[PDB]
């Protein structure tokens, strides 16, 4: 479960491993890491089985909620804290669950692109670049990293990223699912 | 029992005479090797002639007791002068009940003009027991055999004064919780008597 | 006066504290091939993780008798246990047969073991290194 | 920490054949090394033809017959006085143990009658529900001695089949003895139900402990 | 709760050809420290039952308590109480092996064996063993404690199977279990010399005997 | 390479034993002879073979000495004997089988890892599970067998076995008679 | 020498990785009879159904044991070669105290770890003796002693039926009772009854299968 | 203690008087809550006139009382008859030296014509202590404060006596671990002599 | 050992003007019972030295042997042994914490703790205390357990400093030490009435005080 | 860590990983000993005492070659090492070691392979392998009794492909030994 996000100067680009399963065999072309809260908001998630998934899924119908209430898109500011009080607030009578939270946005008010990460306490980051999984790549982001790089040279950042973490990991590492969301909204890219 | 508390050791007597009952205690209160307070009045009264002595935690058997006192007050609200036997009921429920939550032992004295005096023990776990006479307390160990020696039915006051006395200087004397001076409380007929005996009176027995 | 074994244990440990077993190229480093222990037992291994009565039984009988030697020494005088002593050394001294590892008859009659067995005596107990005769005579002899 | 469960040992077995039901057990009530009771059976005759028995801790095979026979009475109040089938009282069973999924009954339960065309059936349940159709099934601390002396002196592909209820009798009262010989708990009765078209019908035998 | 604080050790039971006979000490020991003398723990309920309880003397007292409010309730408002409407040793059997049960299903249960005897309303002799866990059996013979270790074979010898009830008489069901109370006097540590013994009989009714002591002790053997 | 466990049974016929022991196919056999006595050991295989080494020391040294072969019962003391050395050190499930040469009685007899010795006039199991093949047996034994009838007892218990839990599994039978004996192979 | 603690680590490695009855004793006015049941079990199943638990110490002296059956045959037979060579060097009847004293000591030396309770019964010049013996070293003196996992049953049925004057043959159908009964009453007991025997002056009678 | 090893759960009572010295005790061994033996010695004879008897673990004081007696052997070989301080000091040293692998408790009471009977007490760890009388074991801790009103010195014979039935059967009665026969040795200048006392007659006191 | 069972209370020193005053109550405790009533902490070794030992009894009757072998082996094969030869407080303290330091390096320390007062050759006052652990240290006033804790606030308020140890008559001092027991006796469950006193002085020489109880006792407010 | 052996039917195969020792990084064989000039051994676990063994194991041999002027048989080798390392830890905690012996029996003129595992339990295999948590696989399917030593080397090279398919960069590569009738040879290429 690795989830890595990057900021450029137009889009924000995310990219989460496949989803396996201890002992079991599964070929599926599907991105169940990954929900799209809105039009312009898209969130990555990794951690615990089944705790993860129930919170992403009422997020995301929390969300869809508030669009449909108001015919209004929330800004990526506004939904992250959102996110970050639901996580407190989940965890508030109960053992805390290991989950990390990457959201993505594009801001149309201000015309820029946003990036947060919440981790398993609550504790909401705006960051320029930011990954989760393995315990390596933050150098390698630190010497390569640029506030005014295009979608292009994030891209390649991206590949050089995966095909680092893919040398070190015993060849069990699979495709990795990469959208980008931008003025024209969220999408997939299959390269 | 919790930790941290405080734990009642001492040395509790109950005997019946003639006459009616007296009630006699230690004034020590120990708190592992140090003496917290060497001056305590341990005789708590819950009614006009009906009293005890309590074993065990302090604050769950302070509890009990104002808890009875207050039964007590409704009951001669309604009734009148209760008898013994109803204050040892009222205490045998209210520790048999909570005896999973608090650790509580209790030894009631009581008069009345029909009964003339009784004695009961309700030991940890809430059981209850009429007796002639009772002993309690980590010092009481010592002077079992003593007490099963020395005593008779129908004794005079002065005998049962003389009793508790000696009983209690050898509680004193072989138990480390128990110390200072005797506390005895007379329950006959014509009212409530106090009596204090000091250590240089009872150590020369 | 002791009943069971008392101070068994080690107060200080060193890599030469066998001297029979000392390497020639290096006196202060033992030698693990004549050793013939299989080559992998540290000395640090036999500190810990022992049974709690192997040292009981090991020194039983010894135990015994400094008990005995003591009330001896208490009651006769010093003469009744330096005698004892002096006999049991003159036996041990003058028995070296290297082809056996039974004791002599004189030692059982003088330990009072004449018609007595213990598990020792029904279980008194290849190598290429330090297992003939001329080993166990320099050992006797301290060559 | 309070330990609820327990254990009193004891020895069930049933077994199905063409036109009748056996459901046997040994009715000796002990705890550790010690006999509690020289008669105590663990077998009992559930309502409509139908026979049940839970062996392993004896307080939770009580409850959970007491409770099946109540949805029973329950059962023929509610419908008519219908009769109550064999595999709906295996579900029924299979409802009342799995209610109890994380404070499980400690019990492993054999129930034996007639199906619906009139063969013989045996339903076995383990203790939190699970349920299986069975030809023959042994349970308690002597299954492994029981067994093998069945599978070596019938066949259930001499075909169990043919076999009629006296010579399945026998084979129980036989397997029961060898257990009894080579086991401890094993011993002082045996008390036998068959189940057929015309009712339950009771034997016991008296074992080599009096 | 958690553990007994004041105890008793056995209660032991037969039955004869008539009816049955029960019999247990009179002790409650703290600990180590024999403590209480004079404790009944032979609850006569009705006319015709009996109920021998051993183990925590609070949980006894309050199964007592229990009883009383069940006899209570029975005359409420059955006006032939004391007519074929009293209460028969299996009601009250029943409703003690429920309490136990659901005591032990919650997690407190009540540290307590307990054997009920009587006769049945048609003479026959009740007899049955319940305790902590709920579990409920019935023997010829039964008892508890170090009684089913040491008083249960003396028992067994005189009554051995169902057969063997009808030849046993009274006194010779008295006999036994006195034998076994004095050996349980013998060898248990926590025992008492004074014992009540307790007979019901479908033609003589309820007898109860109080303050029995142990005789015949045999000490001469020492020197 | 697993090999620790397997089982092993002894019993006994008319004039004869019969002792037999599981094997794994896919070398390492659990049954080792010292002239008319018979041993199967199971267990941890290296004790097993330290068993075996010393035994067949201790033999060697009694036949040079007594100048005779040791009959099984004076074989079973010296078992009990090695297995006690090894009080608070202890390897296993040995069982003894053999005729005498002189009565010619059968004799089997097994041993805890203490030497404590139980001596079965009718069959010994040996190995990890015992519970069914100690069952199987217990249904398939009957006294005073001549050696074809034991043999096929003991090889239906060993396949009834086997039946109820593989690919690669085999069994190593010996029927020992006082002048002859027999060594056969199941493979199922 | 003596018993070895070879591979007691390894054992322990091993452990942590997960590699895995009823006699009496009644003494009467001129002897002392051991009687015992005769089934051995491993576990719940019985591996034997007649097997003989007394053992013989010396021709006059028989005990019957309890706890660990190797440790208890081996101290036994250690003890009987001891006492045989005790005998023989003082060419004198072997006495219990003796034995008792051995056993004591022995017992003792290893401080518990060799778990052998046993009942020592005999008859020497002296008279006749009884002796309870613990594992840990510590030995008691009794008229009657009762030992197993029945052994409630049978210190039920001596205490019901002994008295200081007992003939032979009392005794004897006393011990088989007591044994009786704990076959019945315990699951631990069963089968046969071995009894032996000891008078003053005469011959040790044993009889195997007594009351089958 | 070790886990499985017999504990001596005793009463013990050593009283010196005019003429000697008397040691008494009870008959019970216990394992727990079952009777091992009704009728026990507990009375070990050292030397001829010196007795003890012994608390704690039973195998490490029958060593030690056994080493003990061949000590004194040894001695009466050489310079006759010893004294109750000599073996009272070997007690003691064996009793010292090995505290840290041996649970053990003496009382010795013995006579001599020098000291005219005396009484010596080592509880566990090994310190010896010289009374003129010493209580011991479960049942000693109910009948200190008897024994403490209830002693004189230089008593008559039968006033000790009496003295030791009284406390030793009311530490039979208030525990658990004392059994039924009384167990008493005079040790005075005409010899040794013993008594016996049964429960029908100390229990009617 | 690796427990003590049997323990004393607690043992107070402290100096005045000419000389050394030590006081130590008489009691032996089997755990929560007084068992014994007739232990004596205090030990006069030699002519002008006394030592005070509190904890497992028969720790101190040990150290109490080895003070006796010490005493007997100075004057051994030394008919001069009584004027130039006599030990000095020093000399014993010494040997005692060096045993206390080797049996604590021996994983066997002696459950004690040891206080040793008296007057030297040349006059000067000595007093000093050792531990179980062999920590050793000095003071113009010392105290052992409970007696660490409320006699030593007591004794200091009549020698706080070095220099009031000349201000401080052997009245005031001992009036001190004796208020210090009876505060004791009254806040300590395992204390004892009994106590015995020990002064040491250059001039006199030595006054040893048995038998000594507890008195002027405070317990009428208790009648309120 | 992992080490391989191949006994085909006239010579033995010998495999071993290179160096790794904590996380220390090194650039560097110190895992297999040369017994007998016909008989090799490859050990594998715990580090500082398998060493010790191993080299105690080699000065015993190469003292009985001198002594007796002749070469020790590889089934004697196998038993004299299972005997030496079940004397090691009957005193001590055992500890991991996995030992290979292989060897060319002259007067038979057979290879031969075996296996002692860490508490002395000699095995004959066919193939071995320790140190892999399988590779029993490759060793089964496609292995005959017959294969000449070519074939052994092809199969033994699938093996050390499989193991770099799942391994980091440091698994530097593995060492190929070849004992037979000419002696002990070491394999570069492959």
Redesign the interface.
Same mark, same amino acid.
Request: overall charge negative; proline content about 3%.
């Given at each position: 479960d690795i989830i890595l996000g990057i900021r450029v100067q137009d889009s924000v680009i995310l990219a989460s491993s496949k989803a396996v399963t201890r002992g079991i065999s599964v070929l599926k072309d599907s991105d169940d890491k990954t929900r799209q809260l809105s039009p312009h908001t898209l969130m990555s998630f990794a951690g615990e089985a089944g705790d993860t998934v129930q919170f992403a899924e009422y997020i995301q119908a929390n969300i869809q909620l508030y669009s449909i209430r108001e015919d209004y898109e929330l800004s990526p500011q506004a939904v992250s804290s959102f996110v970050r009080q639901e996580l407190a607030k989940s965890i508030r009578s109960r053992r805390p669950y290991q989950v990390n939270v990457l959201i993505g946005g594009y801001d149309k008010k201000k015309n820029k692109p946003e990036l947060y990460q919440i981790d398993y306490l609550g504790t909401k980051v705006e960051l320029p670049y930011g990954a989760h999984g393995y315990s390596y790549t933050f150098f390698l982001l630190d010497h390569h990293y640029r506030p005014d790089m295009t979608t292009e040279e994030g891209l390649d950042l991206l590949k050089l990223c995966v095909q680092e973490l893919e040398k070190r990991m015993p060849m069990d590492f699979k495709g990795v699912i990469v959208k980008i969301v931008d003025k024209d909204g969220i999408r997939q890219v299959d390269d | 029992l919790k930790k941290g508390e405080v734990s009642l050791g001492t040395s509790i007597m109950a005997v019946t005479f003639k006459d009616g009952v007296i009630l006699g205690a230690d004034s020590r209160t120990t708190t592992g090797a140090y003496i917290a307070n060497r001056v305590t009045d341990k005789l708590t009264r819950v009614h006009d002639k009906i009293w005890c002595c309590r074993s065990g935690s302090a604050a769950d058997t302070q509890a009990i007791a104002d808890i009875v006192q207050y039964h007590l007050e409704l009951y001669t609200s309604q009734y009148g002068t209760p008898s013994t036997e109803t204050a040892a009921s009222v205490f045998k429920e209210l520790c048999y009940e909570n005896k999973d939550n608090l650790t509580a032992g209790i030894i009631v004295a009581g008069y009345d003009d029909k009964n003339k005096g009784e004695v009961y023990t309700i030991p940890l776990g809430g059981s209850v027991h009429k007796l002639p006479y009772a002993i309690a307390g980590s010092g009481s160990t010592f002077i079992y055999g003593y007490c099963d020696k020395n005593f008779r039915e129908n004794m005079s006051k002065e005998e049962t004064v003389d009793f508790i006395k000696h009983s209690l200087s050898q509680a004193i004397k072989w138990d480390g919780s128990s110390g200072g001076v005797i506390r005895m409380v007379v329950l006959t007929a014509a009212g409530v008597e106090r009596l204090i005996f000091y250590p240089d009176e009872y150590e020369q027995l | 006066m002791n009943i069971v074994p008392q101070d068994t244990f080690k107060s200080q440990v060193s890599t030469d504290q066998d001297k029979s077993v000392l390497s020639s190229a290096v006196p202060s480093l033992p030698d693990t091939l004549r050793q013939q222990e299989g080559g992998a037992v540290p000395l640090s291994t036999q500190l810990n993780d022992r049974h709690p009565l192997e040292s009981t039984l090991k020194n039983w009988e010894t135990t015994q008798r400094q008990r005995q030697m003591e009330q001896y020494r208490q009651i006769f005088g010093i003469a009744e246990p330096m005698k004892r002593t002096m006999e049991m050394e003159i036996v041990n001294r003058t028995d070296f047969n290297p082809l056996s590892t039974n004791g002599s008859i004189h030692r059982d009659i003088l330990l009072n073991k004449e018609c007595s067995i213990d598990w020792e005596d029904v279980y008194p107990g290849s190598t290429m290194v330090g297992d003939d005769v001329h080993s166990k005579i320099e050992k006797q002899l301290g060559i | 920490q309070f330990n609820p469960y327990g254990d009193n040992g004891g020895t069930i077995l049933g077994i199905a054949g063409e036109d009748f039901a056996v459901l046997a057990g040994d009715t000796r009530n002990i705890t550790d090394y010690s006999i509690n009771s020289r008669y105590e059976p663990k077998v009992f005759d559930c309502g409509d033809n139908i026979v049940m028995s839970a062996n392993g801790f004896a307080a939770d095979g009580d409850a959970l017959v007491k409770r099946f026979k109540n949805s029973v009475k329950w059962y023929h109040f509610d419908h008519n006085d219908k009769k109550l089938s064999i595999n709906s009282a295996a579900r029924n069973i299979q409802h009342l143990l799995y209610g109890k999924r994380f404070f499980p009954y400690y019990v492993h339960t054999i129930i034996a009658g007639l199906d619906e065309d009139g063969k013989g059936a045996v339903y076995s349940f383990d203790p939190v529900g699970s349920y299986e159709r069975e030809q023959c099934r042994a349970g308690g601390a002597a299954a492994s001695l029981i067994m093998p002396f069945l599978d070596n002196q019938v066949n259930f592909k001499k075909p169990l089949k043919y076999l009629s209820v006296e010579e399945v009798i026998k084979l129980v009262r036989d397997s029961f003895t060898s257990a009894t010989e080579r086991h401890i708990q094993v011993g002082d009765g045996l008390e036998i139900l068959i189940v057929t078209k015309d009712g339950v019908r009771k034997e016991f035998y008296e074992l080599k402990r009096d | 709760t958690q553990q007994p604080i004041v105890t008793g050790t056995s209660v032991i039971s037969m039955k004869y050809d008539n009816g049955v006979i029960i019999a247990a000490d009179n002790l409650g020991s703290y600990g180590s420290l024999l403590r209480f003398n004079g404790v009944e723990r032979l609850i006569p309920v009705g006319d015709n039952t009996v109920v021998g309880i051993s183990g925590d003397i609070s949980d006894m007292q309050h199964i007592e308590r229990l009883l009383k409010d069940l006899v209570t309730e029975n005359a409420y408002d059955n006006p032939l109480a004391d007519a074929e409407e009293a209460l028969e040793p299996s009601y009250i059997f029943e409703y003690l092996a429920t309490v136990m049960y659901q005591r032990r299903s919650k997690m407190n249960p009540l540290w307590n064996a307990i054997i009920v005897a009587g006769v049945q309303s048609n003479g026959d002799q009740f007899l049955r063993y319940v305790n902590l866990l709920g579990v409920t059996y019935s023997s010829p013979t039964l008892a508890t404690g170090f009684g089913a270790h040491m008083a249960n074979p003396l028992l067994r010898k005189v009554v051995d199977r169902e057969s063997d009830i009808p030849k046993t008489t009274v006194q010779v069901a008295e006999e036994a279990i006195v034998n076994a109370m004095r050996v349980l006097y013998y060898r248990d540590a926590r025992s008492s010399r004074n014992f009540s013994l307790a007979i019901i009989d479908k033609n003589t009714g309820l007898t109860f005997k109080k303050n029995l002591q142990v005789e015949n002790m045999k000490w001469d053997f020492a020197k | 390479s697993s090999i620790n466990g397997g089982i092993v049974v002894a019993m006994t016929g008319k004039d004869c034993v019969a002792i037999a022991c599981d094997l794994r196919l896919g070398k390492f056999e659990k049954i080792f002879h010292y002239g008319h006595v018979f041993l199967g050991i199971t267990g941890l295989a290296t004790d097993v073979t330290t068993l075996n080494e010393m035994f067949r020391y201790k033999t060697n040294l009694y036949k040079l000495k007594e100048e005779r072969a040791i009959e099984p019962e004076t074989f079973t003391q010296l078992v009990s004997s090695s297995l006690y050395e090894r009080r608070f050190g202890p390897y296993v499930g040995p069982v003894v089988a053999g005729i005498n040469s002189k009565s010619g009685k059968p004799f089997i007899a097994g041993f805890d890892l203490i030497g404590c010795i139980d001596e079965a006039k009718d069959f010994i199991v040996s190995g990890t599970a015992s519970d069914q093949l100690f069952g199987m047996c217990e249904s398939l034994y009957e006294p005073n067998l001549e050696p074809e009838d034991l043999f096929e007892t003991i090889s239906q218990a060993l396949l009834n076995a086997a039946d109820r839990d593989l690919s690669g599994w085999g069994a190593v039978v010996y029927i020992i008679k006082k002048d002859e004996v027999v060594k056969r192979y199941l493979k199922m | 020498?003596?018993?070895?603690? !070879? @591979?007691?680590?390894?054992? @322990?490695?091993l452990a942590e990785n997960s590699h895995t009855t009823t006699i009496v004793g009644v003494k009467f006015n001129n002897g002392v009879v051991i009687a015992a049941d005769t089934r051995? /079990?491993?576990g719940?199943?019985?591996?034997?159904?007649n097997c003989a638990k007394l053992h013989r110490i010396s021709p006059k002296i028989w005990c019957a044991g309890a706890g /660990?059956?190797? !440790?208890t045959?081996?101290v036994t037979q250690?003890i009987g070669?001891?006492i045989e060579?005790?005998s023989?060097?003082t060419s004198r009847e072997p006495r219990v105290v003796s034995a008792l004293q051995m056993l004591?000591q022995?017992?003792?030396?290893?401080?518990?770890?060799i778990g052998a309770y046993l009942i020592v019964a005999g008859v020497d010049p002296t008279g006749s003796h009884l002796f309870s013996i613990?594992?840990?070293?510590? /030995? !008691?003196?009794?008229?009657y002693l009762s030992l197993g996992?029945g052994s409630?049953?049978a210190?039920?049925?001596l205490?019901?039926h002994?008295?200081?004057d007992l003939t032979k043959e009392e005794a004897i159908k006393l011990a088989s009772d007591a044994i009786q009964?704990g076959i019945? @009453? !315990?699951?631990?007991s069963?089968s046969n009854v071995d009894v032996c025997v000891m008078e003053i002056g005469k011959d040790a009678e044993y009889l195997r299968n007594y009351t089958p």
């Amino acid at each position: 479960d690795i989830i890595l996000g990057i900021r450029v100067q137009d889009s924000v680009i995310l990219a989460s491993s496949k989803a396996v399963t201890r002992g079991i065999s599964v070929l599926k072309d599907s991105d169940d890491k990954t929900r799209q809260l809105s039009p312009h908001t898209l969130m990555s998630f990794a951690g615990e089985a089944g705790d993860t998934v129930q919170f992403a899924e009422y997020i995301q119908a929390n969300i869809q909620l508030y669009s449909i209430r108001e015919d209004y898109e929330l800004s990526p500011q506004a939904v992250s804290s959102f996110v970050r009080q639901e996580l407190a607030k989940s965890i508030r009578s109960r053992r805390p669950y290991q989950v990390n939270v990457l959201i993505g946005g594009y801001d149309k008010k201000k015309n820029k692109p946003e990036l947060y990460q919440i981790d398993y306490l609550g504790t909401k980051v705006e960051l320029p670049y930011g990954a989760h999984g393995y315990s390596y790549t933050f150098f390698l982001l630190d010497h390569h990293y640029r506030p005014d790089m295009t979608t292009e040279e994030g891209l390649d950042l991206l590949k050089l990223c995966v095909q680092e973490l893919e040398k070190r990991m015993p060849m069990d590492f699979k495709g990795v699912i990469v959208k980008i969301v931008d003025k024209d909204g969220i999408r997939q890219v299959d390269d | 029992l919790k930790k941290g508390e405080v734990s009642l050791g001492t040395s509790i007597m109950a005997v019946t005479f003639k006459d009616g009952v007296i009630l006699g205690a230690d004034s020590r209160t120990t708190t592992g090797a140090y003496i917290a307070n060497r001056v305590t009045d341990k005789l708590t009264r819950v009614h006009d002639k009906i009293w005890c002595c309590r074993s065990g935690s302090a604050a769950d058997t302070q509890a009990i007791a104002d808890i009875v006192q207050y039964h007590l007050e409704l009951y001669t609200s309604q009734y009148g002068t209760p008898s013994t036997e109803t204050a040892a009921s009222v205490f045998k429920e209210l520790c048999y009940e909570n005896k999973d939550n608090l650790t509580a032992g209790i030894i009631v004295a009581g008069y009345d003009d029909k009964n003339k005096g009784e004695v009961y023990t309700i030991p940890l776990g809430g059981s209850v027991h009429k007796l002639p006479y009772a002993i309690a307390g980590s010092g009481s160990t010592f002077i079992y055999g003593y007490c099963d020696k020395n005593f008779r039915e129908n004794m005079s006051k002065e005998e049962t004064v003389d009793f508790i006395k000696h009983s209690l200087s050898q509680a004193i004397k072989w138990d480390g919780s128990s110390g200072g001076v005797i506390r005895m409380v007379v329950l006959t007929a014509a009212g409530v008597e106090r009596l204090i005996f000091y250590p240089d009176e009872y150590e020369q027995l | 006066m002791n009943i069971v074994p008392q101070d068994t244990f080690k107060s200080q440990v060193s890599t030469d504290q066998d001297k029979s077993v000392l390497s020639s190229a290096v006196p202060s480093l033992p030698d693990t091939l004549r050793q013939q222990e299989g080559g992998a037992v540290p000395l640090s291994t036999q500190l810990n993780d022992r049974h709690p009565l192997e040292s009981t039984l090991k020194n039983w009988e010894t135990t015994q008798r400094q008990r005995q030697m003591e009330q001896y020494r208490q009651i006769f005088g010093i003469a009744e246990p330096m005698k004892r002593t002096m006999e049991m050394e003159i036996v041990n001294r003058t028995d070296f047969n290297p082809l056996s590892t039974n004791g002599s008859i004189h030692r059982d009659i003088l330990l009072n073991k004449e018609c007595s067995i213990d598990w020792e005596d029904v279980y008194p107990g290849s190598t290429m290194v330090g297992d003939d005769v001329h080993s166990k005579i320099e050992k006797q002899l301290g060559i | 920490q309070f330990n609820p469960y327990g254990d009193n040992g004891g020895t069930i077995l049933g077994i199905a054949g063409e036109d009748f039901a056996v459901l046997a057990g040994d009715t000796r009530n002990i705890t550790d090394y010690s006999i509690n009771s020289r008669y105590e059976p663990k077998v009992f005759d559930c309502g409509d033809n139908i026979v049940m028995s839970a062996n392993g801790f004896a307080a939770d095979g009580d409850a959970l017959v007491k409770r099946f026979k109540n949805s029973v009475k329950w059962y023929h109040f509610d419908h008519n006085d219908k009769k109550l089938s064999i595999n709906s009282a295996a579900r029924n069973i299979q409802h009342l143990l799995y209610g109890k999924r994380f404070f499980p009954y400690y019990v492993h339960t054999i129930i034996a009658g007639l199906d619906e065309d009139g063969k013989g059936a045996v339903y076995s349940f383990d203790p939190v529900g699970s349920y299986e159709r069975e030809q023959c099934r042994a349970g308690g601390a002597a299954a492994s001695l029981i067994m093998p002396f069945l599978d070596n002196q019938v066949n259930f592909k001499k075909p169990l089949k043919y076999l009629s209820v006296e010579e399945v009798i026998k084979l129980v009262r036989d397997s029961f003895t060898s257990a009894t010989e080579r086991h401890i708990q094993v011993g002082d009765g045996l008390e036998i139900l068959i189940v057929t078209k015309d009712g339950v019908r009771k034997e016991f035998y008296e074992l080599k402990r009096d | 709760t958690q553990q007994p604080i004041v105890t008793g050790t056995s209660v032991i039971s037969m039955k004869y050809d008539n009816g049955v006979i029960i019999a247990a000490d009179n002790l409650g020991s703290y600990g180590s420290l024999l403590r209480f003398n004079g404790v009944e723990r032979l609850i006569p309920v009705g006319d015709n039952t009996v109920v021998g309880i051993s183990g925590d003397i609070s949980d006894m007292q309050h199964i007592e308590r229990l009883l009383k409010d069940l006899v209570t309730e029975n005359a409420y408002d059955n006006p032939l109480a004391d007519a074929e409407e009293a209460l028969e040793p299996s009601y009250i059997f029943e409703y003690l092996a429920t309490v136990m049960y659901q005591r032990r299903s919650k997690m407190n249960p009540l540290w307590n064996a307990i054997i009920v005897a009587g006769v049945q309303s048609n003479g026959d002799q009740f007899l049955r063993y319940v305790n902590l866990l709920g579990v409920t059996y019935s023997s010829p013979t039964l008892a508890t404690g170090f009684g089913a270790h040491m008083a249960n074979p003396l028992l067994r010898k005189v009554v051995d199977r169902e057969s063997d009830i009808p030849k046993t008489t009274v006194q010779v069901a008295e006999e036994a279990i006195v034998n076994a109370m004095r050996v349980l006097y013998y060898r248990d540590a926590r025992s008492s010399r004074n014992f009540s013994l307790a007979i019901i009989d479908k033609n003589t009714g309820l007898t109860f005997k109080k303050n029995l002591q142990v005789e015949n002790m045999k000490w001469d053997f020492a020197k | 390479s697993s090999i620790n466990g397997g089982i092993v049974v002894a019993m006994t016929g008319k004039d004869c034993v019969a002792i037999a022991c599981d094997l794994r196919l896919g070398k390492f056999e659990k049954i080792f002879h010292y002239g008319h006595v018979f041993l199967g050991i199971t267990g941890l295989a290296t004790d097993v073979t330290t068993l075996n080494e010393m035994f067949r020391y201790k033999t060697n040294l009694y036949k040079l000495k007594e100048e005779r072969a040791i009959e099984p019962e004076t074989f079973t003391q010296l078992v009990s004997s090695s297995l006690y050395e090894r009080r608070f050190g202890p390897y296993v499930g040995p069982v003894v089988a053999g005729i005498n040469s002189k009565s010619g009685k059968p004799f089997i007899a097994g041993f805890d890892l203490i030497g404590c010795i139980d001596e079965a006039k009718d069959f010994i199991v040996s190995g990890t599970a015992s519970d069914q093949l100690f069952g199987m047996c217990e249904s398939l034994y009957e006294p005073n067998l001549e050696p074809e009838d034991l043999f096929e007892t003991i090889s239906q218990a060993l396949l009834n076995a086997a039946d109820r839990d593989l690919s690669g599994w085999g069994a190593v039978v010996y029927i020992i008679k006082k002048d002859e004996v027999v060594k056969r192979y199941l493979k199922m | 020498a003596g018993l070895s603690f !070879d @591979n007691y680590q390894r054992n @322990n490695f091993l452990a942590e990785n997960s590699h895995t009855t009823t006699i009496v004793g009644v003494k009467f006015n001129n002897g002392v009879v051991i009687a015992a049941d005769t089934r051995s /079990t491993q576990g719940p199943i019985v591996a034997d159904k007649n097997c003989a638990k007394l053992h013989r110490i010396s021709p006059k002296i028989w005990c019957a044991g309890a706890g /660990t059956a190797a !440790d208890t045959e081996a101290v036994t037979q250690l003890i009987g070669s001891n006492i045989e060579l005790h005998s023989l060097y003082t060419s004198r009847e072997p006495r219990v105290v003796s034995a008792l004293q051995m056993l004591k000591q022995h017992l003792f030396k290893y401080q518990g770890h060799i778990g052998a309770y046993l009942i020592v019964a005999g008859v020497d010049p002296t008279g006749s003796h009884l002796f309870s013996i613990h594992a840990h070293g510590s /030995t !008691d003196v009794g008229y009657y002693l009762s030992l197993g996992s029945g052994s409630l049953a049978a210190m039920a049925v001596l205490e019901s039926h002994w008295k200081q004057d007992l003939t032979k043959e009392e005794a004897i159908k006393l011990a088989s009772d007591a044994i009786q009964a704990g076959i019945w @009453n !315990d699951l631990g007991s069963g089968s046969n009854v071995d009894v032996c025997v000891m008078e003053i002056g005469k011959d040790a009678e044993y009889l195997r299968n007594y009351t089958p």
